[PDB]
């Protein structure tokens, strides 16, 4: 269909519509849900798209890159095992080891960008406890990253919260400021309301959720 946006949106526009921080009481962590914990998001990228492409840590520490030719490469936390993803969506696996003629100036850029990450980015969350990026863009606002799972992730800029929205859980996962990790059920969001910050995120979500589905 098309990878769980429409079953976002519509979950978005449910909690939006049910107005949650538009209360005088709230108890935002009565909607938190431990059954909702998502398995993977983006704990590290980095945007150069100009010449390269765009390179990027799960969670799990595997690392990949979608590249300008729209094929991506993953390489999984063993160092070794590869994903490559054609730009039909056609999948094959190899290993760096096999050392790959077809693939060398690939796997070679793949590392530069597991490098930089690795001793240069701070991972989003990491004191807590496999899909592709199948698209992604900027605004001057946060970048938007959509996984092969449906998930949505959205970093914002300047107080480098974020929010990762999982359509199969329909639950929402929140890291603040202080780097805290939080996981909502949306039903739950709309029963029991949330504080004015978090409600306008997923405001700013579903209008990114729009702009994944209108391109």
């Given at each position: 269909?098309?990878?769980?946006?429409?079953?976002?949106?519509?979950?978005?526009?449910?909690?939006?519509?049910?107005?949650?921080?538009?209360?005088?009481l709230v108890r935002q962590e009565e909607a938190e849900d431990?059954?909702?914990?998502?398995?993977?998001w983006v704990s590290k990228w980095v945007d150069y798209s100009d010449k390269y492409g765009l390179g990027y840590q799960?969670?799990?520490?595997?690392?990949?890159?979608?590249?300008?030719?729209?094929?991506?490469?993953?390489?999984?936390?063993?160092?070794?095992?590869l994903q490559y993803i054609e730009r039909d969506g056609t999948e094959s696996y190899l290993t760096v080891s096999s050392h790959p003629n077809s693939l060398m100036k690939k796997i070679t850029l793949l590392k530069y960008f597991?490098?930089?990450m690795s001793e240069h980015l701070l991972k989003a969350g990491?004191?807590?406890?496999?899909?592709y990026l199948r698209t992604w863009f900027r605004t001057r606002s946060a970048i938007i990253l959509h996984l092969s799972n449906g998930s949505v992730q959205i970093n914002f800029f300047q107080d480098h919260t974020k929010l990762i929205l999982c359509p199969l859980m329909a639950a929402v996962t929140y890291?603040?400021?202080k780097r805290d990790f939080r996981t909502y059920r949306l039903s739950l969001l709309e029963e029991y309301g949330c504080?004015?910050?978090?409600?306008?995120?997923?405001?700013?979500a579903r209008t990114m959720?729009?702009?994944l589905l209108s391109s």
């Open positions: 269909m098309d990878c769980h946006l429409s079953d976002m949106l519509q979950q978005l526009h449910s909690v939006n519509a049910s107005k949650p921080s538009e209360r005088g431990p059954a909702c914990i998502p398995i993977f799960l969670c799990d520490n595997s690392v990949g890159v979608l590249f300008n030719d729209s094929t991506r490469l993953i390489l999984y936390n063993d160092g070794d095992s597991r490098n930089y990491a004191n807590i406890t496999l899909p890291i603040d400021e504080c004015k910050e978090l409600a306008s995120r997923l405001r700013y959720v729009d702009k």
